[PDB]
Amino acid sequence: SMGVRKLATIRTAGEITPIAGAEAIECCHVDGWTCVIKKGEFKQGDRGVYFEIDSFIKEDNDRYPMLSKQVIDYEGQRGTRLRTARLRGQLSQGLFLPMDRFPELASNQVGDDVTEILGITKWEPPISTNLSGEILGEFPTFISKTDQERVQNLIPQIEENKGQKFEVTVKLDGSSMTVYRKDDHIGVCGRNWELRETATNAQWHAARRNKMIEGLQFLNRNLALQGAIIGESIQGNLEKLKGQDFYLFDIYDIDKAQYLTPIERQSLVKQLNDNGFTVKHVPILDDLELNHTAEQILAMADGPSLNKNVKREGLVFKRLDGKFSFKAISNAYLEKHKDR
């Protein structure tokens, strides 16, 4: 999977191209991103600070006067959130600023995470937590979480893993949920917390309707089923589904501290289905053998979702051996959904 994000990093300008009719700016490639810069601000190879989309940059007319016209109030604090945008027709994601405006980074690395050095934080869309009335404990220390790295940041490795095969799945928009078994206890979790079973609780309800608690009693293993519950009253219900339901996308072997490879996870889901435990998986598309650009897999990211009449958030790719994974988020979808 992944760890936690490096919102502000020192990188190097890739290929720099003109922007038609707008010749006070130019298009700058930062490794897998395209990002609009002022003319002559960089030349290919010069170092700068790259802030990815979803960065939150507090208001500062000394370092970020060019952010002065997108100032919002976020969580009670005033600043600018970097989001995918189209400027003079050019798709632009992130902010790339020269090194000479950040004296405190002169000693610093290429690849350095200076997110906290520069006080930048991650912006997130509003989310309704559960209440403290159903919270159970903390999301178990012994279970991996769901995050995936973006293809835009893995351009050297997309070249070194060339030739390998990938399970490709649709990334759905929902709330994170984990149903796990450690030896005698079975638990249900949100993204950050474990939940107590009530008949009313939505995660427990979904776990009890697809019967995945009884599936983990049946499998008699210490496993964590990880996915999203998506549907009505969950974060836009962007697939328009009836009700709510759990869609599995990974299985964590608690005992081995590792994820089942796609065919193991696929070998384990059917078994559940074959024994009457109707556990859903995110839509699985055809395996693909790596022979592609970062830009072209991103082209594959656009498309229909589980609701094929809806635009998908993207696709996820992890190699059949399970030792390298990434997501490619559809930029078409990001451009359409501006609270995302």
Automatic annotation (TrEMBL):
Q: Where does Mn(2+) 2 bind?
A: 124
Quote the record's binding site residues for Mn(2+) 1.
54
* Residues that, per the record, bind ATP 1: 5, 122, 146, 148, 150, 169-172, 191, 228, 318, 327
Q: Where is the RNA ligase domain?
A: 165-329
Q: Which residues bind ATP 2?
A: 5, 122, 148, 150, 169-170, 172, 191, 318, 327
Instruction: Keyword check for Repressor, yes or no.
Output: no
Q: Where does ATP 3 bind?
A: 122, 146, 148, 169-172, 191, 228, 318, 327
Task: Report residues binding AMP.
Answer: 146, 169-172, 176, 228, 318, 327
UniProt entry tagged with the keyword ATP-binding: yes
Query: Could you say which residues bind Mn(2+) 3 here?
Result: 147
- Please state what the protein is called: Predicted protein
Source species of the chain: Naegleria gruberi
Please name the taxonomic classification of the source.
Eukaryota, Discoba, Heterolobosea, Tetramitia, Eutetramitia
